[PDB]
Design a protein around this nucleic acid. Structure first.
Lengths: 92, 102, 94, 80, 323, 83, 96, 93, 105
DNA sequence: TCCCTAGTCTCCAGGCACG
DNA sequence: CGTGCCTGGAGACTAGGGAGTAATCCCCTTGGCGGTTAAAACGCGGGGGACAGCGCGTACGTGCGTTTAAGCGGTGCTAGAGCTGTCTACGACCAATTGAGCGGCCTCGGCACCGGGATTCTCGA
DNA sequence: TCGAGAATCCCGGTGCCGAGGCCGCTCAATTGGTCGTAGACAGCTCTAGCACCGCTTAAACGCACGTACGCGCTGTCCCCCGCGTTTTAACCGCCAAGGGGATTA
């Protein structure tokens, strides 16, 4: 399996468009996109933490790095979804 | 489960372990993996929805890399997100200069 | 036919398509030739060769698009080597 | 070897330029294009062989090519 | 029966308070000392005292060392510290605290002789504290405190019959002595939604009758100064005492007086009873507490008994308000 | 204490001319000033957004110079010497 | 009467603006513009004087690079005057 | 607090290079920034290689590879020569 | 004995070791890595400083100015490739005048 | 300094990923 | 269609973070005022760059006959990619330990600056 | 091609501030131990990169051939450069209001 997220990709795709298929090449491209975004966000968070001299990786720095990376409306919607997700995880 | 507890789709524990083994910080927040998974799911959702729009523009029921590249070029914020990333066999967005036209 | 009409048709056909348009055997030969300058008797995975070919295609496509944009900026319709050098200087390659 | 740089044919270069949306290409373009192609390929193959040698492996892997392309600032998708 | 441990912990707490500038240690040491003095049993082992809440590893080790050796090496070394002793002596005077005493010791001023010799370096409050350093440290007898409270009440009634002055605190609780006088004053025309010179008139009346001798700070709500009961033309003059008078709204005067009556344990017990009864009690008023903890409109306050019945508690006299 | 606006005109035509001559332009049209102001505003805004984000992620109220360096690296400028 | 050639004071000071290393940007207007741009991001935010000087220097560098690119572009079109269209072409070629 | 920089090392190296040359403090800070930039770049490259090589140690082989990657041209070829010989000294006590 | 003296270097070795450990760059850090990094830093610093000194001799100024360092960095090609995306504060630009801009008659 | 909540190991298991 | 792990929840143990704000007075910080003087704005030739059209020619698309190398279908065949089991150097970690480095405080000439005078381009005729 | 004039350079002299230079004081690199283990190394197994060959076929290669568009020529025009003139703002200094910090309750 080599630690892929393809099952999650298919689940989310069916969540968005349950009536369409995906190529294996397309699935690999999406997996690489997810990996690249993860690495970029992680490097941004680490650089922020060192720049803020903190010895932990926290959700505050995650939101900061995401706001750095994503463009305006995309950053607003993504941070909104992340805040709601954190609210649901902490409350429940 | 943790992905059930957050209600998301990507494996949150997988992301937690990836952050742990990524050697990025001494300590890693527990809700930090939730936030990272949420952002990844958001981005993947927007990418897939644009992909489905482009696929139905091409009347094809399979997601194709050409449609993916066309969507990535067609969205301004997404294009500026992944401007320096190349997609295999995705082609290029059709763009003919007006001066080239007769 | 009309000069340009075939050209524009081929332009649109290449922009709609997604193939490589590069001979894989000559590309492998060129990659091996360049690799001989770096390390003799090296092996290359086939998928790696296809990926390198595709990356070369991407770089050439970007450079040619920039050259055409420059030609329109230079009020010229034919792309000339001066345009390629102007783009490479503007793109910061050399 | 066997003028492998000449392997990129003039019709192939024209096909690439049409994919690049070029309406007219001069005759001198076909050689400087080959030159620049070599330059990009050389600057990529150097790093690739460096990565593979640091891998102490006798075969060039595709993931090495991807890592080098990222080191060359051109992110590529389609290999992992 | 833990007097020595409490005494050695008090001076250690002073080191964390005024010298170390660590209230996070001073308050903890003070709570531990209060609990040790509150235990009417002989302390034999640090582990035995560790059963009491608020006593941890450092406190237990210090108590064991004090019991075994009769002193503490750190305490002995810090008591002999000239800088620490100078800072502690300087902080004893009002107006000088941690940074003030630290700067004074840094500038070579270590004794009251330097304090008098550097009057230009002392502000009005600092100068008043230096002038009345010995006078402020004396206790005020219940007779002298009652006489001064009666004089203040007479001055207030002359200033305004509608003025209401209440001497809260240990004197209200019936203690035979206090270090200072804390008056809570109200006016029917001065409410939560209602003059800035009401306290000024009372201050002028008290200063005119030569009751208040010096003023440290005077605002529209509270005034602090030094006052002293006059001698009868043949006896020694009474020592200077600190008098503070705070003006409160009519709807807030009863809650302020109840809070200032004490004691701290009684205030905590009443607040806990109110919180368990779904109410919040403060110095200003008492408010209902919602199901989600959201406080509603504060209940009207007109008497201490009304506040006690608000939290469903029997009204207690201030003498019974020790805890 | 009073906020101000319309400072984009603060970049005077003489200033633009001096900057271009430092860049080495022999002749400049007058329309260059407006577009130059636009490009400068765009670049400064792109840098300043990330700078303010870096400042607030550090929960500080002053725009720090190290934050500016981090932003310049984020935008791939990486000016040296400062910080 | 002794007026220099119409393209000679232009050729002058280009060497003088290349040999020097000054800011060439007025510091008060730069700080005003910086404050104006930061207010739209956040009101009541402080910017250090060193930060303002560095930002001014960075903007000068970006403008210098863009202007050099535009000069080369005008040379590419066999022209002398720098045009806003040339600046647009340079920005497109850079990718911004 | 105590701020760390390579100022003394830079001064010693400069004296070793040009015995009679001065330098400004601003120039010293610029040199410090260059040194820090090269340090961070080499460290990140080596870490990325180690993750690519899935190794848990940072070896001198990774340093040679990092120098070969980041450093350009003849500066790459000479520096490794200066490295391994210096490494030889570390292996020569 | 200092480790940099044990290698014969001028830049600090143990300082680099502490920085690398604190840099959270890897799980483990080998001994010769600090030596190689210090050697590379020394080589780069020497190459920059020698060019700067030559420029200052050409500029007849005994101290090194930031413009001198910038001119040196623009003079070398490998350094320029190394520092192509690096800006030198108050360093200016190298003299570059267009041939078309030159006046001829 | 004491605390309390959150970040680590660890530690099986009803259950998701896999071929 | 089993089935093969596996993170999810629950101990077990351990680290940062906050446990007190109001009331009054004072110093550092910051924002506005004012002369002034370099500097920016304005204004006016005019001439030199921008630019539009004509001639042309030659070089590049364009259609076509041909071929030859690239796919493309076999075929095998091994160098080495990858996975496994030890053990062993070896990096990490701990506890003194001293000294390279750091902070503070001179200082004396490098170097900016000024001013004059000599130097040499430079437009104009 | 000179020549007046104006921008530039060089040289002397001046004053000023920072590079370094020194010196006392530390915490971070050194010494010298241990101790779990990363990977080093030997070894084994499968697999994909070659490696090759016959067929096909179409990309390509070379070649007539028109034409258009790059370019060089021309005039022609107007925009912005140079030089002088008139505000003007920035800028340095010079002032006073409030934000943060102090003790204390």
């Amino acid at each position: 399996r080599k630690e892929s997220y393809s099952v999650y990709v298919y689940k989310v795709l069916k969540q968005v468009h349950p009536d369409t298929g995906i190529s294996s090449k397309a699935m690999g491209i999406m997996n690489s996109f997810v990996n690249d975004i993860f690495e970029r966000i992680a490097g941004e968070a680490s650089r922020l933490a060192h720049y803020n001299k903190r010895s932990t990786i926290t959700s505050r720095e995650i939101q900061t790095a995401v706001r750095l990376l994503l463009p305006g409306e995309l950053a607003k919607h993504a941070v909104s979804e992340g805040t709601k997700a954190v609210t649901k995880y902490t409350s429940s | 489960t943790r992905s059930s507890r957050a209600g998301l789709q990507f494996p949150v524990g997988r992301v937690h372990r990836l952050l742990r083994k990524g050697n990025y910080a001494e300590r890693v927040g527990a809700g930090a993996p939730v936030y990272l998974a949420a952002v990844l799911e958001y981005l993947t959702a927007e990418i897939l929805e644009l992909a489905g729009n482009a696929a139905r523009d091409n009347k094809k029921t399979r997601i194709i890399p050409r449609h993916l590249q066309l969507a990535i070029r067609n969205d301004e914020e997404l294009n500026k997100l992944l401007g320096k990333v190349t997609i295999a066999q995705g082609g290029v967005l059709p763009n003919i200069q007006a001066v080239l036209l007769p | 036919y009309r000069p340009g009409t075939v050209a524009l048709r081929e332009i649109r056909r290449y922009q709609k398509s997604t193939e490589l348009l590069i001979r894989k055997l000559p590309f492998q030969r060129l990659v091996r030739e360049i690799a001989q300058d770096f390390k003799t008797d090296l092996r290359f995975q086939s998928s790696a060769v296809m990926a390198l070919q595709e990356a070369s295609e991407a770089y050439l496509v970007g450079l040619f698009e920039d050259t055409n944009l420059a030609a329109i900026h230079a009020k010229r319709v034919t792309i000339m080597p001066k345009d390629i050098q102007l783009a490479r200087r503007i793109r910061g390659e050399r | 070897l066997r003028d492998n740089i000449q392997g990129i044919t003039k019709p192939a270069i024209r096909r690439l330029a049409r994919r690049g949306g070029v309406k007219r290409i001069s005759g001198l373009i076909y050689e400087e294009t080959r030159g620049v192609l070599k330059v990009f390929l050389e600057n990529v193959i150097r790093d690739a062989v460096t990565y593979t040698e640091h891998a102490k492996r006798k075969t060039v892997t595709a993931m090495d090519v991807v890592y080098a392309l990222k080191r060359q600032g051109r992110t590529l998708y389609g290999f992992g | 029966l833990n007097g020595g441990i409490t005494d050695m912990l008090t001076e250690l707490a002073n080191f964390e308070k005024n010298v170390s500038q660590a209230i996070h240690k001073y308050n903890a040491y003070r709570k531990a000392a209060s609990v040790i003095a509150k235990y009417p049993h002989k302390i034999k082992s640090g582990a035995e005292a560790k059963k009491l809440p608020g006593v941890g590893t450092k406190i237990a080790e210090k108590i064991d060392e004090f019991l075994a050796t009769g002193k503490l090496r750190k305490l002995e070394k810090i008591r002999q510290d000239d800088t620490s002793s100078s800072i502690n002596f300087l902080t004893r005077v009002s107006g000088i605290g941690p940074s003030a005493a630290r700067k004074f010791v840094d500038e070579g001023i270590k004794t009251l002789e330097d304090l008098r010799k550097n009057e230009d370096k002392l502000n009005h409050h600092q100068r008043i504290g230096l002038k009345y350093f010995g006078d402020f440290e004396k206790r005020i007898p219940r007779e002298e405190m009652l006489q001064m409270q009666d004089i203040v009440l007479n001055e207030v009634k002359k200033v305004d019959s509608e003025y209401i002055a209440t001497v809260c605190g240990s004197f209200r609780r019936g203690a035979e002595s206090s270090g200072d006088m804390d008056v809570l004053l109200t006016h029917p025309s001065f409410t939560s939604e209602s003059q800035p010179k009401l306290l000024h008139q009372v201050v002028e009346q008290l200063q005119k009758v030569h009751f208040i001798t010096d003023t440290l700070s005077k605002g529209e709500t509270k005034f602090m100064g030094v006052c002293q009961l006059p001698s009868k033309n043949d006896e020694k003059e009474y020592p200077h005492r600190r008098i503070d008078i705070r003006l409160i709204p009519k709807d807030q005067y009863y809650c302020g007086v109840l809070y200032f009556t004490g004691s701290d344990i009684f205030n905590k017990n009443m607040r806990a009873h109110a919180l368990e009864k779904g109410f919040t009690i403060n110095e200003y008023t008492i408010r209902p507490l919602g199901v989600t903890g959201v406080a509603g409109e504060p209940l009207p306050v007109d008497s201490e008994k009304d506040i006690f019945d608000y939290i469903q508690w029997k009204y207690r006299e201030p003498k019974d308000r020790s805890e």
